[PDB]
């Protein structure tokens, strides 16, 4: 029950040694002795990449057929086309159940 | 900011954290009340459920069992 | 639920099957039925690029709602009347389907009843 | 984990370990402190009820039935301290523990920084070198001819002596090495 | 940042605080070097509860083999300092 | 050691807190209708989610 | 930093459920020797705490006041 | 084609006339330049091969193999000059001569137009390999390993010779162009069955096919580092190349004679992959992963489809690079702790951080992480196998799951956990080892951007 | 008094439920002391080399050498062809091969007889 | 060209820039995490534009 006297003595000496070592792991004030703009981020990380990609897509990728395919735009009754100027007829005299 | 440990006491609190917490809880409750006042149908429905028993036999094309 | 209990626990031959329905002709009891009207043409629906499920007799109101959402884009709270009209039309379609279910149920409960009563006068 | 184990645990050790384990699991079941205090006092009373039993067969049977009770009644998800063997931070910092002998392989440019640290390290290395033969001699004289019965180590019994086999205990990396 | 650099005096203060909050041991009599058995007349079962209270205070678990030996507050303080690498 | 007065923590949590409140209404009212809504329900079937959550 | 422990003589189990535990254990012939150590969990700002529903309605009052003032303003402004 | 052969032959007198302290520099520089010259063979046609002369020709199947063969010599020289430091000058030159002769034989083997010349060179590759293994291996088992290497191969290839001179006596030629154009079906007869077996078993032993793969875990394990590098990266692919070349004469007999080999490959894939899970020797684990990978090449060649042939070519190249890198990575640790037991040195990521990154990338390519060419070849073979029979997806799927398991296990055992306390001689990585890893891994990743260069003649 | 816990292969019997730690003879205590002595001498022998300043390298562990040697090179010299060994070898090595051969041959025969009668729907099957 | 494709591609492309700087003298500085966080915030702001186009 409890430490034997030799156990306690050994623990004490080891504790003093360990505390001295941990104290020695400390650094001196000089110890790390080394040897001898407002919006710039938004142009080198956004404007420059979007310049290269837009140039790449417009003049190289779209040179080949079917490379960029877009979903056909929705057409509704009453719309006016910008290509032929055609007018879509309206939607057939609603029952007007109101 | 610098608050220190207190050892078995309630911790030190700042004014900004409390007013922010209360403000956001109040914002959530105001939003709920506003949306319920304006968009009740999203919870209580907008149309009634028709009872089939209230539909007559002529509304549905039913013969009087003799033809 | 009741309709599930009456079928799975009661007599299933007294109530319609959701898969095999309708089983009676559309003029079995009605004297004159007018064909259901559609407003939006096939080309209009196709131009609109509506979903196949979406292309239901309520399609013209959905087309109007889509056009209204696109026309007033920044104000995403302007298409309330159009959404209400489309929802009302879909509600009417749903109650029509409920009416069809009830009609089939009462036709089916009348049919077997009348045949078993014709058999009831044939005992002797 | 610092004391040498014995060939076996005595009856007193077993019942004490059972008491601590049962109290910990009871605290796991009783989340709140007042309820834990109540049932822990009841547990202590239940343990004290047979504190001075002198029939070792009866004491052993009672301890065995207590073990069977605990195993059925244990919490399947007992509370564990975060750095304990089952905890959520058990060996979390082992990836940061680097042995000190690695410092011997630093490039001289790396050692150019921290001159004081490495002078102290040279003194520590000289101390370790100078006391090794005395420690070996002490171990051989103290231990029995057959060999050492237990893993307990002796302290330094002379004046300018260090306890034998001390370097790796003393130069442990850290518990928060980085 | 994280927890402050806990020191030796803090460990001793907390150990003595917890001991003085124990009803079995009176505050005036208790001393740092007091044996829990000879000085305070405490049973083995009682000792286990002190160890558990220290675990709850400092938030770490002391192994049973290590725990039984600790019979003085100074011993507990030294054990905790050795575990947490406390050198002042 | 309880301390939550770091601006990084507060701002990071608050940004998601605002989403957790308003994102549903903002997103739901800007996406085109991609289905047919359930405009017709029994009342006990409309309120079932709230009823079971409260239970 | 540079702070010390509060006095240990202030931690009394009086008024807290630790009293109830003490009475229930006295009615059994035992005593609870660790109660005061838990006393700090019921003493200061931890003495009182909110219930579940009160926690759920943490900011209900202020939000309700803003909601009613906004409704009152817009309902009468809508009568142009 | 002599513009590659003759510079390779000049590496011998250059090595023998070099200074005692300049052999490694000269050999490395000039083998790298030979690799640079070899890169010109990748310019392949879409219709027929590059017929240099009556003797040598290059195809889209042999060009990547040639490039890998020439590229491997500088890496072998870099990997060998550390453990041969204390060696005498003449024995260092003899080791380098063995490597140069091996490269010369392989280069001529991959480009021979006639099957008998191909056979003679493909058998000549045995002598330098056996000398390397049994003279510079480290342990006493290296002798037995050599015998296993020698007699497994020859017992397979001696019938092949008898078949080949038989074929020339009936068709009149063994030229591969003539063999392909004047091809005729194989009848269904016992004589044709045994001629089919004689033309196939030699290549099956080289792959090796599960069942006759015993020589490989001995030879690769006991060999020195350059020996195991060349054994895994190039010598195993001789069987694949020869099977791909000789399959033309085999049809339509191959449809039913391939069943036992397909069953052996599709089950031994699982068997060897699972063997890797319980392997106390790290180098032995790496060796068994090779059998597991070459089972897939056997399946792809047996089912005889364009997708399978493309996949087999890609997988052969990718496996060569990855297995060579893994053997080098294990050798780095062996030269520290002098034991091949996997659990002896642990937690090395703490002590060697960048070599841990090398380990991670090698393990990732071993389990065919997309879009690496390991994955390209594996997935092409799996798709072709699915076409051959859908049930194959079960076996193929299972192999993929197991391969990832023993790869990352190999990573977790050696790099993670805590470093063993007693070992204290683990020095920082040298620039030579780091560059050796980089020169393995960078070409592998670069081949992802131009996979058609390694997809063979069926692309 | 309580539902009894029974051990299994992958969930073994705990120490506190093991009746051996509760029926102790003097011989049992002697055996435990002997075990401690064996462990202790090994620990001391390890720590003497471990703490040695002069030592540079890896401490060689004979137990690890014995384990690897037994797991690889000691197996064939200690093998005898027995009815159990022969049966297990034949089953575990041959049975899967013919099982898979039967499965694949059946599937491919079905597929080929379907192709022959022109009922598979191989449309859009350009790549194989 | 309409900006939809360019913006959608640039959103993903700019996320890779701090990876190309993983061998630069920002990765050994204590300002690297803030640099990564700022890049992700800018990417989010850029991705908000194609979402507006789709909602329109
Ligand atoms: C999508 C990414 C975009 C990339 C932009 C361009 C980047 C080009 C890099 C090319 C690769 C470099 C070669 C690898 C060796 C690195 C040498 C080294 O030691 O550096 C130390 C150097 C210095 O660090 P240190 O502090 O000294 O390190 C100390 C320790 O070593 C501690 O070191 P550590 O812990 O930092 O470890 C190094 C680090 C990084 O180290 C590596 O892992 C390098 C190898 C990556 C895995 C490759 C093997 C797996 C099979 C797939 C192969 C794909 C190849 C693609 C083509 C490559 C062509 C070269 O580890 C990791 O980050 C995890 C790696 C696992 C990656 C998981 C994702 C795999 C799929 C990714 C998508 C691939 C296709 C993209 C296109 C898809 C469609 C758009 O660290 C660096 O500079 C960063 C390393 C580069 C990381 C790139 C990770 C992504 C690579 C994607 C493939 C290339 C794509 C390029 C085209 C655009 C896409
Ligand atoms: C461990 C790794 C080893 C390498 C594995 C190599 C595998 C080699 C297997 C060869 C594949 C097939 C060989 C011959 C084809 C059919 C063989 C026989 O089983 O089928 C029947 C053959 O009929 C009889 O069964 C004769 C064969 C019986 C005698 C041979 C003994 C085979 C037992 C297995 C020995 C183990 C092989 C490996 C040895 C080490 C077919 O019926 P039948 O219509 O009549 O004959 C048609 C063939 N014709 C057209 C040529 C006439
Ligand atoms: C590492 C182990 C690898 C083992 C490889 C060994 C198997 C090789 C396959 C058999 C080799 C001999 C084949 C002979 C070469 C074929 C040439 C040929 O076509 O000749 C045949 C003749 O074929 C034979 O005679 C071969 C019979 C076998 C003779 C030697 C027996 C070897 C053992 C046979 C079974 C083993 C093969 C499979 C074992 C796989 C490996 C375990 C017909 O010619 P003709 O006589 O002119 O007929 C037409 C006009 N009458
Ligand atoms: C959730 C928890 C699950 C429930 C767990 C069930 C456990 C069983 C409950 C009742 C406990 C028992 O039976 S009690 C075990 C039965 N046998 C004895 O008690 C023998 C006599 N003991 C002594 O003499 C020692 O001195 C000692 C008493 C250890 C003090 O020692 P110290 O004073 O010198 O430290």
Q: Which among H365, H364, H367, H443 has a CA at the least distance from the CA of H402?
A: H367
Q: Give the pocket of ligand 3 (CB within 6 Å).
A: H 152, 155-156, 159, 162-163, 166, 191, 194-195, 197-198, 201, 205, 212
Strands of F1-55 (E only): list them. none
Q: Which among H350, H346, H345 has a CA at the least distance from the CA of H428?
A: H350
User: Under a CB-based contact definition with an 8 Å cutoff, are residues J55 and C73 in contact?
Assistant: yes
In sign, the C-alpha dihedral spanning H394, H395, H397, H402 is positive
Cβ-based contacts of A50 with chain J (< 8 Å)? 6-7, 10
DSSP H125: T
d(CA D32, CA D26): 11
Residue of minimum CA distance from atom 14 in ligand 4 = D47
d(CA A74, CA F33): 14
Task: Provide the residue ranges of all domains of chain E, joining segments of one domain with +.
Answer: 8-84
CA angle H423, H427, H428 (to 5 degrees): 135
d(CA D173, CA D168): 9
Q: Which residue(s) pair with H175 in the sheet? A: H114
Please tell me whether the peptide bond between B41 and the residue prior to it is cis, using omega within 30 degrees of 0.
no
Element (H, E) at I44: helix I26-50
d(CA B48, CA B55): 15
Q: Residue A2, by phi and psi: left (phi above 0), alpha (psi -120 to 50) or beta? A: left
Q: Which among H421, E84, D172 has a CA at the least distance from the CA of A21?
A: D172
Both tokens of residue F8? Answer: 């990084």
Q: Which residues contact H55 (CB under 8 A, 6 or more apart)?
A: H112, H113, H114, H117
Q: Which among H336, H334, H356, H232 has a CA at the least distance from the CA of H286?
A: H232
Ligand 4: atom nearest CA of D25 is: 1
Q: If you count them, how many residues does chain B have?
A: 67
* Dmax (CA) of chain C: 80
DSSP per-residue letters across chain E = --S----HHHHHHHHHHHHHT-SSS-TTT--TT--TTTTT---HHHHHHHHHHHHHHHT-PPPHHHHHH--SHHHHHHHHHHHHT---
Q: Which residue(s) pair with H341 in the sheet? A: H281
- Is J6 in the A-facing interface, judged by CB distances under 8 Å? yes
Q: Which residue(s) pair with H84 in the sheet? A: none
d(CA D23, CA H444): 60
Cβ-based contacts of B28 with chain F (< 8 Å)? 21
d(CA D135, CA I47): 12
Both tokens of residue H111? Answer: 């480009």
Q: Which among A68, A65, A47 has a CA at the least distance from the CA of A57?
A: A68
Distance H389 CA to ligand 1 centre (A): 37
Question: Please, is D68 exposed, middle or buried when counting C-beta atoms within 10 Å of its C-beta (0-12, 13-18, 19+)?
Answer: middle
User: Under a CB-based contact definition with an 8 Å cutoff, are residues C108 and C114 in contact?
Assistant: no
d(CA C2, CA E68): 70
User: Under a CB-based contact definition with an 8 Å cutoff, are residues H452 and H377 in contact?
Assistant: no
* Residue corresponding to tokens 């329905």: C21
> Is position E82 annotated as part of the catalytic site?
no
d(CA H35, CA G33): 84
SS3 H114: strand
d(CA B51, CA G21): 61
Residue of minimum CA distance from atom 52 in ligand 2 = H189
SS3 B47: coil
- Is G20 in the D-facing interface, judged by CB distances under 8 Å? yes
Which other chains touch chain F, taking contact as 3+ CB pairs less than 8 Å apart?
A: B, C
Question: Which residue among H350, H421, H424 sits closest to D95, beta carbon to beta carbon?
Answer: H350
Mutant choice from D151, D170, D175 vs A, greatest count of A C-beta within 10 A: D170
Q: Phi and psi dihedrals of I59, rounded to 5?
A: -75, 125
d(CA H451, CA H440): 17
SS3 I70: helix
Q: CB distance J10–A62 less than 8 Å?
A: no
Both tokens of residue D146? Answer: 């057959």
DSSP H232: I
Cβ-based contacts of F37 with chain C (< 8 Å)? 87, 90
Question: Please, is D95 exposed, middle or buried when counting C-beta atoms within 10 Å of its C-beta (0-12, 13-18, 19+)?
Answer: middle
Distances in whole angstroms, Cα of residue H261 to Cα of each of E15, F51, G75, I101, I106: 75, 64, 86, 10, 17
What's the per-residue H, E or C state across H335-351? HHHCCCECCCCCCHHHH
Minimum CA–CA partner of E46 in chain D: D44
d(CA D51, CA D15): 10
Ligand 3: atom nearest CA of H201 is: 5
User: Under a CB-based contact definition with an 8 Å cutoff, are residues H315 and H308 in contact?
Assistant: no
Distances in whole angstroms, Cα of residue H287 to Cα of each of B29, H262, H292, H374, I61: 66, 21, 9, 17, 25
Q: If you count them, how many residues does chain G have?
A: 80
Residue of minimum CA distance from atom 16 in ligand 2 = H257
Element (H, E) at D143: none
Resolution of the deposited coordinates, in angstroms? Answer: 2.6
Based on its alpha-carbon atoms, the radius of gyration of chain E, rounded to whole angstroms, reads 13
Cβ-based contacts of A24 with chain E (< 8 Å)? none
Q: Which residues contact H236 (CB under 8 A, 6 or more apart)?
A: H206, H207, H208, H290, H294, H319, H320
Q: Which among G36, E71, I16 has a CA at the least distance from the CA of D22?
A: I16
Question: Please, is B22 exposed, middle or buried when counting C-beta atoms within 10 Å of its C-beta (0-12, 13-18, 19+)?
Answer: middle
d(CA J38, CA H40): 46
Distances in whole angstroms, Cα of residue H112 to Cα of each of H1, H51, H62, H175, H233: 11, 10, 10, 9, 20
CA angle J48, J49, J55 (to 5 degrees): 90
Out of E13, E26, E43, E56, the active site residue is E43
Element (H, E) at I122: none
Q: How many CB atoms lie within 10 A of CB E87?
A: 18
Which other chains touch chain A, taking contact as 3+ CB pairs less than 8 Å apart?
A: C, D, E, J
Question: Please, is H300 exposed, middle or buried when counting C-beta atoms within 10 Å of its C-beta (0-12, 13-18, 19+)?
Answer: buried
Query: Alpha helices of J3-31 — where are they, by DSSP H?
Result: 3-14, 17-20
Both tokens of residue D151? Answer: 């893993």
d(CA A92, CA A77): 10
User: Under a CB-based contact definition with an 8 Å cutoff, are residues D5 and D149 in contact?
Assistant: no
Both tokens of residue H69? Answer: 């063969």
Distances in whole angstroms, Cα of residue H255 to Cα of each of H181, H185, H196, H295, I108: 21, 12, 11, 18, 11
Q: Which residues contact H102 (CB under 8 A, 6 or more apart)?
A: H125, H128, H129, H132, H230
Element (H, E) at G72: helix G60-77
Cβ-based contacts of C54 with chain F (< 8 Å)? 33, 35-36
- C-alpha I125 chain-centroid distance: 46
Distances in whole angstroms, Cα of residue H233 to Cα of each of D9, H14, H290, H325, H433: 59, 26, 10, 10, 18
d(CA H67, CA H107): 9
DSSP A46: I
Based on its alpha-carbon atoms, the radius of gyration of chain I, rounded to whole angstroms, reads 30
In sign, the C-alpha dihedral spanning H103, H363, H459, I121 is positive
- C-alpha B1 chain-centroid distance: 38
d(CA H322, CA H338): 23
User: Under a CB-based contact definition with an 8 Å cutoff, are residues C72 and C78 in contact?
Assistant: yes
Both tokens of residue A55? Answer: 């140039």
Both tokens of residue B2? Answer: 């610098």
Both tokens of residue G31? Answer: 């005593």
Which other chains touch chain D, taking contact as 3+ CB pairs less than 8 Å apart?
A: A, E, G, H, I
- Is H431 in the D-facing interface, judged by CB distances under 8 Å? no
Residue of minimum CA distance from atom 21 in ligand 3 = H191
User: Under a CB-based contact definition with an 8 Å cutoff, are residues H125 and H235 in contact?
Assistant: yes
DSSP per-residue letters across C46-88 = HHHT--TTT-STTHHHHHHHHHHHHHT-S-TT--HHHHHHHHH
Q: If you count them, how many residues does chain D have?
A: 178
Both tokens of residue I52? Answer: 């040695």
What's the per-residue H, E or C state across H4-68? HHHHHHCHHHHHHCCCCCCHHHHHHHHHHHHHHHHHHHHCCCCCCCEECCCCEEECCCHHHHHHH
Residue of minimum CA distance from atom 99 in ligand 1 = J16
Minimum CA–CA partner of C70 in chain F: F32
User: Under a CB-based contact definition with an 8 Å cutoff, are residues H34 and H8 in contact?
Assistant: yes
Q: Which residues contact D32 (CB under 8 A, 6 or more apart)?
A: none
Element (H, E) at F55: none
Looking at the CA of D18, name the nearest ligand.
4
**Fold of domain E8-84:** 1.10.1200
User: Under a CB-based contact definition with an 8 Å cutoff, are residues H435 and H78 in contact?
Assistant: yes
From C79's Cα to the closest Cα of chain A, the distance in A is 16
d(CA I99, CA I123): 32
* Residue corresponding to tokens 């102290």: D120
């Amino acid at each position: 029950s409890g430490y034997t006297p030799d156990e306690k003595l050994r623990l004490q000496q080891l504790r003093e040694l360990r505390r001295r070592w941990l104290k020695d792991q400390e650094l001196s004030p000089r110890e790390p002795v080394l040897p001898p703009r407002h919006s710039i981020f938004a142009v080198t990380h956004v404007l420059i990449p979007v310049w290269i990609i837009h140039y790449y897509l417009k003049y190289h990728v779209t040179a080949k057929p079917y490379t960029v395919v877009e979903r056909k735009p929705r057409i509704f009754p009453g719309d006016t086309i910008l290509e032929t100027g055609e007018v879509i007829p309206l939607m057939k005299e609603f029952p007007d159940q109101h | 900011v610098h608050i220190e440990p207190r050892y078995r006491q309630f911790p030190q609190l700042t004014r900004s954290q409390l007013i922010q917490a209360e403000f956001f809880s109040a914002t959530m409750w105001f939003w709920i009340l506003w949306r319920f006042w304006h968009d009740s149908d999203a919870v209580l429905g907008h149309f009634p459920y028709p009872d089939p028993s209230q539909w007559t036999d002529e509304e549905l094309g039913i013969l009087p069992d003799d033809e | 639920g009741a309709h599930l209990a009456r079928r799975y626990l009661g007599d299933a031959s007294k109530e319609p099957d959701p898969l095999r329905m309708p089983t009676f002709p559309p003029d079995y009891g009605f004297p004159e039925r007018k064909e259901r009207e559609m407003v939006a043409t096939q080309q209009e629906m196709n131009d609109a690029q509506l979903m196949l499920q979406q292309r239901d007799y309520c399609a013209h109101y959905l087309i109007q709602l889509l056009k209204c959402k696109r026309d007033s884009f920044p104000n995403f709270l302007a298409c309330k009347h159009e959404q209400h009209d489309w929802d009302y039309c879909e509600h009417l379609d749903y109650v029509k389907r409920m009416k069809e279910f009830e009609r089939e149920r009462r036709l089916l409960q009348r049919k077997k009843r009348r045949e078993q009563r014709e058999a009831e006068m044939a005992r002797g | 984990a610092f004391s040498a184990p014995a060939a076996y645990l005595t009856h007193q050790q077993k019942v004490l370990r059972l008491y601590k384990r049962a109290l910990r699991h009871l605290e796991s079941w009783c989340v709140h402190r007042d309820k834990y205090r109540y049932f822990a006092c009841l547990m202590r009373a239940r343990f004290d009820e047979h504190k001075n039993e002198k029939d070792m067969v009866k004491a052993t049977q009672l301890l065995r039935q207590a073990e069977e009770e605990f195993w059925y009644g244990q919490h399947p998800q007992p509370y564990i301290f975060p750095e304990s063997p089952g905890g959520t931070s058990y060996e979390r910092y082992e990836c940061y523990k680097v042995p000190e002998w690695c410092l011997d392989d630093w490039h001289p440019s790396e050692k150019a920084m921290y001159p004081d640290y490495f002078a102290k390290r040279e003194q520590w290395k000289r101390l370790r070198r100078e006391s090794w033969e005395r420690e070996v001699k002490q171990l051989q004289e103290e231990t029995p001819p057959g060999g050492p019965r237990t893993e307990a180590l002796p302290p330094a019994r002379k004046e300018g002596d260090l306890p034998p086999l001390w370097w790796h205990i003393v130069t442990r990396p850290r518990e928060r090495p980085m | 940042s994280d927890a402050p650099p806990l020191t030796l005096e803090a460990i001793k203060d907390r150990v003595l605080y917890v001991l003085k909050l124990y009803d079995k041991i009176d505050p005036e009599k208790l001393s740092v070097n007091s044996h829990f058995m000879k000085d305070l007349g405490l049973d083995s079962l009682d000792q286990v509860e002190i160890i558990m209270a220290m675990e709850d205070e400092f938030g770490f678990e002391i192994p049973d083999i290590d725990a039984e030996k600790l019979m003085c507050p100074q011993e507990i303080v030294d054990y905790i300092a050795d575990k947490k690498d406390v050198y002042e | 050691l309880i301390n939550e007065n770091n601006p990084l923590l507060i701002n990071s949590i608050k940004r998601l807190l605002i989403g957790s409140i308003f994102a549903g209404f903002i997103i739901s009212n800007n996406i085109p209708p991609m289905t047919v809504p359930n405009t017709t329900m029994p009342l006990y079937m409309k309120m079932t989610a709230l009823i079971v959550t409260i239970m | 930093s540079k702070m010390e422990l509060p006095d240990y003589k202030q931690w009394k189990i009086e008024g807290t459920p630790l009293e109830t535990v003490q009475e229930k254990l006295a009615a059994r012939g035992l005593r609870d020797p660790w109660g005061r150590n838990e006393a700090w969990r019921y003493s200061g700002g931890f003495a009182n705490n909110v219930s579940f529903v009160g926690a759920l309605l943490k900011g209900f009052k202020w939000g309700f006041a803003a909601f009613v003032v906004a409704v009152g303003a817009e309902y009468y402004l809508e009568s142009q | 084609m002599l513009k590659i052969i003759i510079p390779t032959t000049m590496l011998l007198p250059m090595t023998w006339m070099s200074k005692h302290n300049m052999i490694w520099i000269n050999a490395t520089v000039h083998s790298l330049l030979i690799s640079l010259i070899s890169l010109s063979l990748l310019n392949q046609l879409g219709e027929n091969s590059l017929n240099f002369s009556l003797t040598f020709f290059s195809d889209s199947l042999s060009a990547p193999l040639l490039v890998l063969t020439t590229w491997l010599l500088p890496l072998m020289l870099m990997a060998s000059q550390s453990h041969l430091s204390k060696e005498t000058t003449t024995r260092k030159k003899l080791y380098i001569t063995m490597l140069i002769l091996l490269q010369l034989f392989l280069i001529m083997t991959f480009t021979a137009t006639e099957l008998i010349l191909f056979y003679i060179l493909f058998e000549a590759t045995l002598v330098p390999t056996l000398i390397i293994i049994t003279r510079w291996g480290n342990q006493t088992e290296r002798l037995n390993a050599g015998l296993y290497f020698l007699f497994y191969t020859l017992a397979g290839s001696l019938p092949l010779l008898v078949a080949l001179v038989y074929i020339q006596n009936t068709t009149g030629s063994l030229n591969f162009l003539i063999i392909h154009y004047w091809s005729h079906p194989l009848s269904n007869s016992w004589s044709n069955i045994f001629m089919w077996l004689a033309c196939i078993m030699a290549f099956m032993v080289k792959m090796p096919l599960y069942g006759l793969h015993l020589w490989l875990p001995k030879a690769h394990v006991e060999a020195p580092i350059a020996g195991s590098m060349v054994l895994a990266a190039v010598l195993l692919k001789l069987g694949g190349y020869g099977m791909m070349r000789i399959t033309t004469i085999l049809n339509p007999l191959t449809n039913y004679m391939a069943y036992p080999f397909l069953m052996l490959s599709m089950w031994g894939m699982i068997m060897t992959s699972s063997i890797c899970l319980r392997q106390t020797d790290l180098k032995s684990l790496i060796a068994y992963s090779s059998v597991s990978h070459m089972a897939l090449v056997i399946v792809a060649i047996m089912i005889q489809t364009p997708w399978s042939f493309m996949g087999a070519t890609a997988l052969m190249i990718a496996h060569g690079l990855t297995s060579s890198m893994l053997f080098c990575l294990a050798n780095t640790n062996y030269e520290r702790v002098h034991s091949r037991t996997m659990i002896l040195a642990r937690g090395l990521q703490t002590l060697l951080p960048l070599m841990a990154t090398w380990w991670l990338v090698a393990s990732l390519t071993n389990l065919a992480l997309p879009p690496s060419i390991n994955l390209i070849g594996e997935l092409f073979i799996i798709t072709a196998s699915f076409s051959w029979s859908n049930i194959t997806i079960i076996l193929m799927g299972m192999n993929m799951m197991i391969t990832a398991l023993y790869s990352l296990y190999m990573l977790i055992t050696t790099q993670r956990g805590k470093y063993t306390h007693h070992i204290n001689n683990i020095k920082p990585s040298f620039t030579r080892e780091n560059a050796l890893m980089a020169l393995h891994i960078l070409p592998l990743l670069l081949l992802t951007l131009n996979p058609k260069m390694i997809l063979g003649p069926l692309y | 008094s309580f539902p009894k816990y029974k051990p299994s292969r992958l969930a073994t019997l705990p120490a506190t439920l093991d009746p051996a730690e509760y029926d102790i003879s003097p011989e049992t205590r002697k055996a435990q002391a002997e075990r401690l002595a064996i462990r202790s001498r090994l620990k001391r022998e390890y720590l003497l080399q471990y703490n040695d300043p002069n030592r540079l390298g890896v401490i060689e562990d004979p137990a690890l050498i014995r384990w690897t040697y037994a797991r690889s090179a000691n197996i064939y010299p200690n093998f005898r062809p027995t009815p159990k060994t022969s049966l297990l070898g034949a089953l575990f090595g041959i049975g899967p091969l013919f099982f898979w051969y039967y499965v694949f041959k059946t599937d491919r025969d079905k597929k080929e007889k379907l192709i022959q009668e022109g009922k598979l729907d191989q449309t859009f099957n350009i790549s194989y | 060209m309409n900006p939809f494709a360019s913006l959608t591609l640039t959103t993903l492309t700019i996320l890779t820039i701090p990876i190309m700087m993983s061998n630069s003298n920002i990765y050994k500085t204590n300002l690297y995490p803030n640099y990564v966080k700022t890049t992700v915030s800018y990417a989010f702001t850029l991705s908000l534009v194609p979402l507006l186009m789709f909602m329109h």
